[PDB]
DNA sequence: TCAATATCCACCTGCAGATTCTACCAAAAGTGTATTTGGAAACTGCTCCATCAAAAGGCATGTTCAGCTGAATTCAGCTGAACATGCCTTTTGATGGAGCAGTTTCCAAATACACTTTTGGTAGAATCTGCAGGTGGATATTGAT
DNA sequence: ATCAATATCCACCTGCAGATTCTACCAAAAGTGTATTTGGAAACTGCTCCATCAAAAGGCATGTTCAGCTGAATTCAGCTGAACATGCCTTTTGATGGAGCAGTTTCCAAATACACTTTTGGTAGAATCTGCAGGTGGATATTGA
C-alpha cells in the first residue's frame, strides 16, 4: 500500500513531478530525494501566497472568482511580489490605477 | 490573398492615444503618434523575428504560441498567460 | 446649449476610464495584418496560432503602455505635461534600448 | 491518439480551496498561475544547476535548491519560502 | 593674476578621466567600506586580495554609466548640473527602484 | 564608514561620466544608491561563499553576484 | 589528428567537447556541434582581436590592453550589442561630452 | 592545474596581427569573453532542444542559437566561419 | 587682435616589471571496438487555420474652435566651481604566523537503475452558476453665469 | 454662490458561456532488490590573508570669491483637446476546405560506453621587451584689456 511522497511531506504539490521535472529538465547529473520536496514546497507556498492576495483583490472587486485583473492588482500592490515579477506580464492584467500628481487639476 | 503593405498605419491614433491613457499620459504631442509606430514596429519585429527563428528550428510551418513566448522570454520581455 | 469640459478633463477622465479596464485597446485585426505582414517578411507562407497573434498583441500593448508611463515621467521632469518624442527617446535611451 | 498535457492547474484549485474556500479562479487565471509555477520553477532550478557546477559538485541537493531560493526571493517572501521548505523536508524525511 | 572661468576646469576634467581608465575611488576607504558591508551578513569574514578590486571595478563602473545616465536626464530637463531628481528618474526608468 | 567614499572621487566619477555641474545634494544622494549597490551584490556573493562552505570571498564569489545582478564583469575568471 | 586541425581552427574541439557534456545542456553531443561552436567562438575572438588590435596602433603601443579592447567593443555596433550587459575590467568610456555642456 | 583560452587566444592573435601582444589583463578579459559567449551560446543551444523534445545538442542547435544570440553581420559571419569549419571537419 | 598665464602634446630617453619563450610532465584528447539509441523517413489521423459571406454600428477621420500649454524672455538670489592652504589619511613595502582553501584516500549513505504493481491526472461529456450587458434611479463633478 | 449638463455609480436582473463536477482510461508515480559513486570525513600541506610598523606625499578638507545657473513670473502664438457629423471598416458567427501538426512504425547512422595509447596544455623557469614617467620645449587654449 503506497502514499505519494506528496502527503510524506505533506504538500498540496506534485513531490513527484517535480523530481521528474528536474531530471527531464537535465540541471544536474543527480538529484537529491529532499530536492523534489523542498522545491515543491517553496512553489506551493508562493502559489498560494498569490492567490491569497488575488482572492482578496477579487473579494474587493465584488465577486467570487480571480481573474487575470486580480492577480495583477496582487502581484503589484505587494512590494515582494512586484521584485519578483518585475519583467513579467499578465495577459489581460492591465495597470495599477495611478495618475501622476502634477496632471490633476490644481 | 491581397498583398499585406503598410499596415503598421493600421495602429491608429485613437488608439496610440488609449495605450497612452493607460500609460498616464493626458497631453499628446502631435509627432508622437509616428514615433510610436515607429517603436511598435521594431518591437513587433525583434519578438516576431526570434519567433519565427524558433518556428523555423523546429521546422515548422506555423508560428505557435510558445514561438512568440520562448520568444518574448528571450528578448527579457517574458509573458504569462498562454505559458502553456 | 451646449455643454462642453476645459481641456484636460476628458484626459483624465480617459486615463481613469483605461486603467480600471484590462481590453485591448488597438484593434485586433489591423494588428494581426501588421503581423503577418512582418512575418511575411522573414519567412513567408507561415501560419499563426489563433493564440499566437493574441500572446503577441497582449505584449506589445503592454510594452507601450508601459513606455508610455516612462515617457510622461520624462516629461514630467522637464517641467512638461505633454510627452513628445523627446520624451520617448529618452525612455529607450535610458532603458538601453536604442543606447 | 490522445496526448494528454500536463499543468499544475488540479494543484492551484487545490491551495485555491485552502485559501479561500468559496472562491473560485478563472481558465485564463489559471493559465497565468500556471506560467507563474513554471517560471518560478524554472529560475530556481537553474540558479540550483549553476550553484551545483560552481561548486564543482554533480548533484542538486535539497540545500542547494534552498540557497538557490534564498538567492532568487526578495527577503520577507525568502524566509517564508525556506521556512515552508524545511518544513517539508524533514516533515517527509521522517516516513 | 589669472583664474579659468566656471565650468571650464570640469571640462578639462571630463577630458581628462573620460581619456584614462584608472580607478578613482580610494582604495583604503573601498575596503573599509566592503567589508563593514559585508558584516551585516557574515562575520570574521576574508576577502580574496581582487575579489575587492572586482567590487572596486563593477562599482565606480556602475555609477559612471549612473552618472551619464542622471547628465542626460538633468539635460533633458534644460539644465546642466546633475540633481538628486535625475538620478532618481534615472534610475526609477531602469527598473532600478520603482 | 560610507562618508569614506569623499566628495572629490564621486565628482571624478561624475566627470568620467561626462558631467559638468554638480548639484552638492548629488553626493549624500550618490552615497546612498552606492551602498544599495554594494549591499546586493555583496548578499549574494557573500551567499555564494556561504554555500560554498567558505570564510573567504573569492573574486569568483563576486564575479557570478555580478552576473546574477546583471552586472556581468570580463577580467575577473 | 587533433580533432581542431582537423576542421582547421586554432580553439580545442576537443575541450568544448568536453565543456558541453558537462554544463548539463543535453544528454548527448553531436559531432560537429564542439567543432561549430569553436569555430563560431575562434571567430569572435578573431572579430575583436582585429578591431583592438587596430586601437592598439592607433594608439601606438603593441601591447593589446583593456582599453583597446573596450574602445574596440563599444566603438563597433554590433559588438557593443552583443556585449551591452558586459563590463570590462580597466575599460573606461569612450570619449563623450554632449553638445550642450560645450564651451563658446 | 587551471586551464583557459589563453594559449588560443593568443593564437589567433599571432595570426591577425603577428606584430602585437596581448597584456595579461586583456588576456583575462578575452578570456572572460570567450566563457561567457559559450555560456550564452550553449544554453540557447540547450533550451533549443528541450522545447523540441530531442536529446542531442547538434551543430543545428548551436547555428540556430548563434542566430538567435548574435545581432546582424556578425551572425552571418559566424554560422558561415561555423558551417565552414564544419564541412571542412567532416571532409578530412 | 593683442599678449600673460597655464595646460597640453610630443620627440627622446634608459629599466625593472610584466611579458613571452622554454623545458618538462599529469590530464586529457584521440582511437579502437562494441553497445545502445535518438529521431529522421514514410504514413494517416483530423485539429486548427485560412477565407469568405454578410449586416451592423463601433470607431475612425476630418473639421471647427479656442483653452491653456509650451516656449521665449527677463531678472538676481545665490549655489557651486576655481583657487589657494594646511594637515592627514592613503599608498606601499616587506614581514609573520597561520587561518583556510584544497588534495587525497576511503567508504557508509545516498542515487541511479531495471521491473512490476498501484494509482492520481487527464480528457470528455454531465450539470451547474458567476457575472456580462442592459436598464434606471441616485450621487458627484463640471463649468456656465 | 446657484444650477443645468454629463458622467460615474451601484443595486437589480436573467440567460448562457465558462466553469465545476462526474465517471472511464493509462502514462507515471510507487515499491523492492541491487549496482554504482558521491561527497563528506579524517588529515596534511602550503598558500594567501590579516595584522602590525614606519615613513613621505599626494589628496582632502576649508574657507574665500563671484561667475552665470537655476528659478520664478510674464506673455503670446499655436498647438492639441473637445465635440460633431460622416460613413468606412472591424466585429461577429458560421461555414468549408485542407495544410500540416502530430500521434506511430521503423531502421540507421550516430552517439555513448570502456580502457588503452599517445599529445597537449599548464607550471614554474629563464631570457627578454615595453610602456613607464620624467624632460622641457613648443605650441594650443583661456582669458582679460
Ligand atoms: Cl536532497
Ligand atoms: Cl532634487
Ligand atoms: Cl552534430
Ligand atoms: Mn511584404
Ligand atoms: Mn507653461
Ligand atoms: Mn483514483
Ligand atoms: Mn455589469
Ligand atoms: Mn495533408
Ligand atoms: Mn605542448
Ligand atoms: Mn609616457
Same mark, same amino acid.
Given at each position: 500500500?503506497?502514499?505519494?511522497?506528496?502527503?510524506?511531506?505533506? +504538500?498540496?504539490?506534485?513531490?513527484?513531478?517535480?523530481?521528474? +521535472?528536474?531530471?527531464?529538465?537535465?540541471?544536474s547529473?543527480?538529484?537529491?530525494?529532499?530536492?523534489?520536496?523542498?522545491?515543491?514546497?517553496?512553489?506551493?507556498? +508562493?502559489?498560494?501566497?498569490?492567490?491569497?492576495?488575488?482572492?482578496?483583490?477579487?473579494?474587493?472587486?465584488?465577486?467570487?472568482?480571480?481573474? =487575470?485583473?486580480?492577480?495583477?492588482?496582487?502581484?503589484?500592490?505587494?512590494?515582494?511580489?512586484?521584485?519578483?515579477?518585475?519583467?513579467?506580464?499578465?495577459?489581460?492584467?492591465?495597470? +495599477?490605477?495611478?495618475?501622476?500628481?502634477?496632471?490633476? =487639476?490644481? | 490573398?491581397?498583398?499585406?503593405?503598410?499596415?503598421?498605419?493600421?495602429?491608429? $491614433?485613437?488608439?496610440?492615444?488609449?495605450?497612452?491613457?493607460?500609460?498616464?499620459?493626458?497631453?499628446?504631442?502631435?509627432?508622437?503618434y509616428? #514615433?510610436?509606430?515607429?517603436?511598435?514596429?521594431?518591437?513587433? #519585429?525583434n519578438?516576431?523575428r526570434?519567433?519565427?527563428?524558433?518556428? #523555423?528550428h523546429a $521546422?515548422?510551418? %506555423?508560428? %505557435?504560441?510558445?514561438?512568440?513566448?520562448?520568444?518574448?522570454?528571450?528578448?527579457?520581455?517574458?509573458?504569462?498567460?498562454?505559458?502553456? | 446649449?451646449?455643454?462642453?469640459?476645459?481641456?484636460?478633463?476628458?484626459?483624465?477622465?480617459?486615463?481613469?476610464r483605461?486603467?480600471?479596464?484590462?481590453?485591448?485597446?488597438?484593434?485586433?485585426?489591423?494588428?494581426?495584418?501588421?503581423?503577418?505582414?512582418?512575418?511575411?517578411?522573414?519567412?513567408?507562407?507561415?501560419?499563426?496560432?489563433?493564440?499566437?497573434?493574441?500572446?503577441?498583441q497582449?505584449?506589445?500593448?503592454?510594452?507601450?503602455?508601459?513606455?508610455?508611463?516612462?515617457?510622461?515621467?520624462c516629461?514630467?521632469?522637464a517641467?512638461?505635461?505633454?510627452?513628445?518624442?523627446?520624451?520617448?527617446?529618452?525612455?529607450?535611451?535610458?532603458?538601453?534600448?536604442?543606447? | &491518439?490522445?496526448?494528454? &498535457?500536463?499543468?499544475?492547474?488540479?494543484?492551484?484549485?487545490?491551495?485555491?480551496?485552502?485559501?479561500?474556500?468559496?472562491?473560485?479562479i478563472?481558465?485564463? /487565471?489559471?493559465?497565468?498561475?500556471?506560467?507563474?509555477?513554471?517560471?518560478?520553477?524554472?529560475?530556481? /532550478?537553474?540558479?540550483?544547476?549553476?550553484? /551545483?557546477?560552481?561548486? &564543482?559538485?554533480?548533484?542538486?541537493?535539497?540545500?542547494?535548491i534552498?540557497?538557490?531560493?534564498?538567492?532568487?526571493?526578495?527577503?520577507?517572501? /525568502?524566509?517564508?519560502?525556506?521556512?515552508?521548505?524545511?518544513?517539508?523536508?524533514?516533515?517527509?524525511?521522517?516516513?
Open positions: 500500500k503506497a502514499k505519494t511522497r506528496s502527503s510524506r511531506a505533506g +504538500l498540496q504539490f506534485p513531490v513527484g513531478r517535480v523530481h521528474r +521535472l528536474l531530471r527531464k529538465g537535465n540541471y547529473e543527480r538529484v537529491g530525494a529532499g530536492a523534489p520536496v523542498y522545491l515543491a514546497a517553496v512553489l506551493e507556498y +508562493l502559489t498560494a501566497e498569490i492567490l491569497e492576495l488575488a482572492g482578496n483583490a477579487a473579494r474587493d472587486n465584488k465577486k467570487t472568482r480571480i481573474i =487575470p485583473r486580480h492577480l495583477q492588482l496582487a502581484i503589484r500592490n505587494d512590494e515582494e511580489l512586484n521584485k519578483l515579477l518585475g519583467r513579467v506580464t499578465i495577459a489581460q492584467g492591465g495597470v +495599477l490605477p495611478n495618475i501622476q500628481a502634477v496632471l490633476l =487639476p490644481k | 490573398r491581397k498583398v499585406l503593405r503598410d499596415n503598421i498605419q493600421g495602429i491608429t $491614433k485613437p488608439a496610440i492615444r488609449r495605450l497612452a491613457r493607460r500609460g498616464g499620459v493626458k497631453r499628446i504631442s502631435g509627432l508622437i509616428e #514615433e510610436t509606430r515607429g517603436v511598435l514596429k521594431v518591437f513587433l #519585429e519578438v516576431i526570434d519567433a519565427v527563428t524558433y518556428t #523555423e $521546422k515548422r510551418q %506555423t508560428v %505557435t504560441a510558445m514561438d512568440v513566448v520562448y520568444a518574448l522570454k528571450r528578448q527579457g520581455r517574458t509573458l504569462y498567460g498562454f505559458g502553456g | 446649449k451646449p455643454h462642453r469640459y476645459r481641456p484636460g478633463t476628458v484626459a483624465l477622465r480617459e486615463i481613469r483605461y486603467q480600471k479596464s484590462t481590453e485591448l485597446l488597438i484593434r485586433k485585426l489591423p494588428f494581426q495584418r501588421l503581423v503577418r505582414e512582418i512575418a511575411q517578411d522573414f519567412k513567408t507562407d507561415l501560419r499563426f496560432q489563433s493564440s499566437a497573434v493574441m500572446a503577441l497582449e505584449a506589445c500593448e503592454a510594452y507601450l503602455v508601459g513606455l508610455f508611463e516612462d515617457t510622461n515621467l516629461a514630467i521632469h517641467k512638461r505635461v505633454t510627452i513628445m518624442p523627446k520624451d520617448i527617446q529618452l525612455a529607450r535611451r535610458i532603458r538601453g534600448e536604442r543606447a | &491518439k490522445r496526448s494528454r &498535457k500536463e499543468s499544475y492547474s488540479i494543484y492551484v484549485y487545490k491551495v485555491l480551496k485552502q485559501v479561500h474556500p468559496d472562491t473560485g478563472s481558465s485564463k /487565471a489559471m493559465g497565468i498561475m500556471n506560467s507563474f509555477v513554471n517560471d518560478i520553477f524554472e529560475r530556481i /532550478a537553474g540558479e540550483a544547476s549553476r550553484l /551545483a557546477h560552481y561548486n &564543482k559538485r554533480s548533484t542538486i541537493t535539497s540545500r542547494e534552498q540557497t538557490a531560493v534564498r538567492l532568487l526571493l526578495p527577503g520577507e517572501l /525568502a524566509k517564508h519560502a525556506v521556512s515552508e521548505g524545511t518544513k517539508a523536508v524533514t516533515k517527509y524525511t521522517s516516513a
